[PDB]
Amino acid sequence: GDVRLSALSTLNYRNLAPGTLNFPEGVTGIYGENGAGKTNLLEAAYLALTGQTDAPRIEQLIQAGETEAYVRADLQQGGSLSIQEVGLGRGRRQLKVDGVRARTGDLPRGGAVWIRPEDSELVFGPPSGRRAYLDSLLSRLSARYGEQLSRYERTVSQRNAALRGGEEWAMHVWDDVLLKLGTEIMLFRRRALTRLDELAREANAQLGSRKTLALTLTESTSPETYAADLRGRRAEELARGSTVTGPHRDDLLLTLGDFPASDYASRGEGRTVALALRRAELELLREKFGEDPVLLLDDFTAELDPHRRQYLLDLAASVPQAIVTGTELAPGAALTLRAQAGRFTPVADEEMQAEGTA
């Protein structure tokens, strides 16, 4: 009855040998050398499960010499099978759910969470990365949000081009649209913030921090003054050649023991905060859907703190299903695979295959 990714197949997907893999309930551990394509399997899974990608360019996902790629996820929730497919090519990501052309919205239970070895950049990196964290999560929570955000981004782009091209007389043509969409986006973010703050605070504590982690939003405007602010900062926007009002300008502020984490958190504290953000993402999806997202744990061996590494492995064992990669096998997994040159092959684990041996 839990959801499960029962199989993943790819063809022409960057750094993956074409083929299929069948995954059991519980943890599938995958080990191999740096460069064997482990992260790309997780990326492909995340794409099939959520319709999202880290790639700045879709062509980056397609094997050299090929012009299209294909990913297929088989999902089993109870006795119900579902099929999620993604076709890639020509800058385009085409989804299908159960054989029918689909929008992102027809994808179900907050499909996956992908914990990534670069996640400390959420703490120490630029505002754009924290907007991407929030936008990604909120788009998984709500189809409407994803559509609004997409339309908003394109509309801001037109406004900014009007400014930069010296067509400032024409700059306000879409301000009604930006008001409406910008307000909805800001409000969705405020709604989620209440729970994300609580969830990240708890995860940070459970990870052993004795400092309080708090999330707040740094906002360019408010719903109540958005229209006034938008229009009222014209002189500034003419000077800058850019739009200075709206959620594309905002940030998720991370405060740890009353100081800005970006500037005062140690490297270890930063790793803990970043993991707390992923745990809060997981739990917020779980609370919304009463359905556990598939956990994609990318390079657990890159976590060099024993306790925090063990937390990741325990979390993976705790959920109905996780796919865990690293340079060595995750102990106790339902299935273990070795990654070589983008090909995944089972290996024996005598500790987990001792049933029916007598």
Q: How is domain 1-117+294-357 classified at the CATH fold level?
A: Rossmann fold (3.40.50)
Structure-token pair, residue 2: 């839990």
Q: Say if residue 165 is exposed, middle or buried (CB neighbours under 10 Å; 0-12, 13-18, 19+).
A: exposed
Any known ligand binding at 38? yes
Any known ligand binding at 35? yes
- What is the torsional sign of CA 103, 107, 113, 117? negative
Residues 6+ apart with CB under 8 A from 189: 134, 138, 217, 247, 250
Alpha-carbon distance 190 to 197, whole Å? Answer: 11
First to last CA, the chain: 32
Any known ligand binding at 39? yes
Torsion region of 187: left, alpha or beta (phi above 0 gives left; psi -120 to 50 gives alpha): alpha
Any known ligand binding at 87? no
Contact between 125 and 263 under an 8 Å Cβ cutoff? The reply is no
- Amino acid at the residue 117: P
Contact between 111 and 82 under an 8 Å Cβ cutoff? The reply is no
- Amino acid at the residue 346: P
| CA 155 to each of CA 103, 171, 238, 248, 280: distance values in angstroms, whole numbers, following the listed order | 21, 11, 17, 11, 31
Any known ligand binding at 37? yes
Residue 110 host element (H or E):
none
Q: Which of 152, 161, 217 is nearest to 180 (CA)?
A: 152
| CA 208 to each of CA 3, 203, 276: distance values in angstroms, whole numbers, following the listed order | 31, 9, 11
Strand, helix or coil for residue 343: strand
Any known ligand binding at 34? yes
Domain boundaries, the chain: 1-117+294-357, 118-293
Q: Which of 118, 82, 155, 67 is nearest to 275 (CA)?
A: 118
Instruction: Confirm or reject CATH 1.20.1050.90 for domain 118-293, answering yes or no.
Output: yes
Q: Which of 112, 124, 128 is nearest to 53 (CA)?
A: 112
Any known ligand binding at 132? no
Discontinuities in the chain with C to N beyond 2.5 Å fall right after none
The full length of the chain comes to 358
Q: Say if residue 355 is exposed, middle or buried (CB neighbours under 10 Å; 0-12, 13-18, 19+).
A: exposed
- How was this structure obtained? X-ray
